[PDB]
Amino acid sequence: QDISLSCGASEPAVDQDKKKWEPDTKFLKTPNTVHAPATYQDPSLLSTVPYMTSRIFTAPATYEIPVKGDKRHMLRLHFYPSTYTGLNILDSYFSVAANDLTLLSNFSAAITCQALTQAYLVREYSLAPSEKDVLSIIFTPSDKHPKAFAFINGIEVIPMPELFDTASLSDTKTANLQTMFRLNVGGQDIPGSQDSGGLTRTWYNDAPYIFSAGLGVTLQASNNFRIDYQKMPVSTAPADVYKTARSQGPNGDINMKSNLTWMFQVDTNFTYIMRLHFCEFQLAKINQKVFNIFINNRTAQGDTNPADILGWTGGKGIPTYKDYAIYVDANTGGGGEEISLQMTPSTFGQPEYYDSQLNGLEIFKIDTMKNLAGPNPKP
Ligand SMILES: *[C@@H]1O[C@H](CO)[C@@H](O[C@@H]2O[C@H](CO)[C@@H](O[C@@H]3O[C@H](CO)[C@@H](O)[C@H](O)[C@@H]3O)[C@H](O)[C@H]2NC(C)=O)[C@H](O)[C@H]1NC(C)=O
Ligand SMILES: *[C@@H]1O[C@H](CO)[C@@H](O[C@@H]2O[C@H](CO)[C@@H](O)[C@H](O)[C@H]2NC(C)=O)[C@H](O)[C@H]1NC(C)=O
Ligand SMILES: *[C@@H]1O[C@H](CO)[C@@H](O)[C@H](O)[C@H]1NC(C)=O
Ligand SMILES: *[C@@H]1O[C@H](CO)[C@@H](O)[C@H](O)[C@H]1NC(C)=O
Ligand SMILES: [Ca+2]
Ligand SMILES: [Ca+2]
């Protein structure tokens, strides 16, 4: 079952999306640590749980959470940078490790939230099977900052399926991942209560990430259309991801003159998995919608093997996804902190229409040298 801990809470509670949270107390091994309420409630909080209570650590502190050693787990860390016991939140710098994996280092939640124009954030990780029955989560105030403290508002550990296998360049089954982005392309926001697999992932509409002048056209499956998952685990992504899409639209000439373009800020010197979710719910035949996919200006799917969703799936309403790996560094145009995803029709093989489509997108950072931490953004 899920372990969803509100750090510093004094009693169990439920949030706005029906998620049950328990106090952290029984899992925190380090004694005599401060628990404190936030003394300001940002209007953008969707709930006071778990955000209005925190732990404050002025020395290292360790949680020990029981887990099954053979299972992958999602780990979520919830941060609400605000005022706690009168401390300056800008003085908080710390690291977080999950066993031997560094998740965060020199982390400033305040600077990160300021750069995002957010009041709180969640950092989500997928941890490979550990072969240990305890997950140790260690918070370490920065020893480079005399005034540093660590803080944490909530910690979740959720067992999850082995949803990762390989990526078009690589094996990702044993990778430890950070979730960078999770989008329901062309569709509505999906709260965790509506996610598949009991995974309580949030899927966000993709419009804020579109950087082409043309926003394309959004598509929705017919009423009572059924997604026919077949061998794809339903936990991969919920049906509303596949029942909605962004396409370029009905005007093939406009489409051939543009790329549909999404842009994402990420950390340099990592490889990322771009998981593109697809489901054709309008067309019925191969070679009707055939498109090129570019990632950071390089062909991910194109030339003589362009993307054709029905080519991949064999049928209307059958979902799929394709994983593409991209290494991001400064030996690149535009500074090494971005991923661009672009689509445009292919002229290869004389398709019936000239269009492109995407139904969902997830971007995951792969661990390097047992680290996933990047720098704080510019404020
Ligand atoms: C911990 O994180 C903080 C906050 O991200 C780091 O401080 C920031 O460090 C960056 C460099 O990565 C500073 O930017 C640089 O500033 C100088 C002077 O203006 C400029 O010459 C550079 O071109 C660059 O822009 C940034 O200003 C700085 N922020 C603050 C508030 O000082 C810090 O270095 C990290 N590590 C440690 C151990 O403190
Ligand atoms: C769609 O996007 C692709 C990928 O960014 C464009 O092709 C690139 O164009 C840039 C800038 O001229 C070049 O640096 C890359 O070498 C090109 N990549 C490839 C694989 O050709 C493509 O021309 C764009 N199409 C439209 C219609 O804008
Ligand atoms: C990225 O890698 C380069 C080359 O090793 C290094 O010089 C640079 O400091 C790295 N940047 C970050 C943010 O780690
Ligand atoms: C991709 O091409 C565009 C258009 O020429 C350019 O502005 C951008 O810097 C290029 N990006 C990369 C990552 O090379
Ligand atoms: Ca809390
Ligand atoms: Ca969708």
Residue numbers in the entry: 28 to 196, 204 to 413
Cite, word for word, the article reporting this structure:
Members of the plant-specific Catharanthus roseus receptor kinase 1-like (CrRLK1L) family are key players in monitoring the cell-wall status and regulating cell expansion. CrRLK1L family members localize to the plasma membrane and are composed of a cytoplasmic kinase domain, a single transmembrane helix and a variable ligand-binding ectodomain. Loss of FER function impairs pollen-tube reception, whereas ANX1/2, together with BUPS1/2, helps to maintain pollen-tube integrity during polarized tip growth, assuring fertilization. The structures of ANX1 and ANX2 reveal an un­expected novel fold with the two malectin-like domains packed against each other and connected by a short β-hairpin linker, forming a potential ligand-binding cleft.
ANX2 crystallized in space group C2, and the structure was solved by molecular replacement using the ANX1 structure as a search model. The structures of ANX1 and ANX2 were refined to 1.48 and 1.1 Å resolution, respectively, with residues 26–411 in ANX1 and 28–411 in ANX2 being well defined in electron density. The ectodomains of ANX1 and ANX2 superimpose with an r.m.s.d. of ∼0.6 Å, comparing 375 corresponding Cα atoms in their ectodomains. Comparison of the ANX2 structures resulted in an r.m.s.d. value of 0.5 Å over 377 corresponding Cα atoms. The glycosyl­ation pattern is conserved among ANX1 and ANX2, which harbours an additional site located at Asn331. Taken together, while the ANX1/2 malectin-like domains share extensive structural homology with both animal and bacterial carbohydrate-binding modules, the surface areas normally used to mediate the interaction with carbohydrate ligands appear not to be present in ANX1/2. Taken together, our structural analysis of the ANX1 and ANX2 fertilization receptors reveal a new tandem arrangement of two malectin-like domains which may have lost their ability to bind carbohydrates in a similar way to previously reported CBM binding surfaces and which form a new potential ligand-binding site located at the interface of the mal-N and mal-C domains.
